[PDB]
Design a protein around this ligand. Sequence first.
Ligand SMILES: Nc1nc2c(ncn2[C@@H]2O[C@H](COP(=O)(O)OP(=O)(O)NP(=O)(O)O)[C@@H](O)[C@H]2O)c(=O)[nH]1
Ligand SMILES: [Mg+2]
Length: 164
Amino acid sequence: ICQFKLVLLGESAVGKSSLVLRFVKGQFHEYQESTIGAAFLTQTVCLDDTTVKFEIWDTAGQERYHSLAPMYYRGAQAAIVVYDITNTDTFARAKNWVKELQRQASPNIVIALAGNKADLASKRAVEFQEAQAYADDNSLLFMETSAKTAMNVNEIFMAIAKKL
Ligand SMILES: Nc1nc2c(ncn2[C@@H]2O[C@H](COP(=O)(O)OP(=O)(O)NP(=O)(O)O)[C@@H](O)[C@H]2O)c(=O)[nH]1
Ligand SMILES: [Mg+2]
């Protein structure tokens, strides 16, 4: 049995709450309310002979809550920095979340990068290749996801668990 602390960070509206909701409850709400501060959820999965329990901190992406982020990532063993593939700005913002983690978070924290809303292919702004190269250059576990279709949602959390 294993337990890990996980934190989600990213610009507001990229889909952090939706990703957690899909993984923890298998639900997706087209009408999701912006998070105020942070929400907490847990999920237990079966991973190669080991039962892993995830303690997830879903932070509010709005800038006015930025100063509170350390409270959630300081003791985190893993982080998922989320961006919206349809918005280049959210990708740039995700890079700064990564820089912050790499500089102020645990030196041994596993950092994942999630290009969310990948189901909106006809509105893509960030090419998969660019995000992959960025992730490879910064040693980030990258995956394009979709809380809406569930694409790679379970996969990203599981890949993180395997590396912990
Ligand atoms: N098409 C599509 N919409 C998505 C996806 N993930 C989230 N959304 C939608 O995007 C909107 C914002 O999602 P939400 O989870 O609230 O974003 P957030 O990053 O948690 N926001 P905040 O940081 O402000 O709390 C919601 O309408 C949600 O339904 C996805 O994979 N695909
Ligand atoms: Mg939210």
